[PDB]
Structure formats: C-alpha cells, structure tokens
Write a protein that binds this ligand. Sequence first.
Ligand SMILES: [Zn+2]
Ligand SMILES: [Zn+2]
Length: 49
Amino acid sequence: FEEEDVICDGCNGPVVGTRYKCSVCPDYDLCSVCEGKGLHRGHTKLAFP
Ligand SMILES: [Zn+2]
Ligand SMILES: [Zn+2]
C-alpha cells in the first residue's frame, strides 16, 4: 500500500506532531520547531494535528 510521508521543508526532518502546511504553495510543510522559528510566514498556513 502507498504511504504519505511529510518532510519539513525547513530542516528536512520528519514532521512529528503538528503539521504546518502552506495554503498557497503546493507541497510546503513545516515542523513545529521550524514554524516556531518563523519560517515562511508570508503565506497563510493550516496547522493540523
Ligand atoms: Zn523543521
Ligand atoms: Zn507558501
């Protein structure tokens, strides 16, 4: 079966916990650490569990 893996665009680490996905870009996500450092805040994001 096919598996979806989310990798953080800031640090290339796996997104464990909350996923901050850009609503503008295709396929841009941040982990909570990179989100907390303020990456990519020129675009609205969705934060899902
Ligand atoms: Zn990260
Ligand atoms: Zn974006």
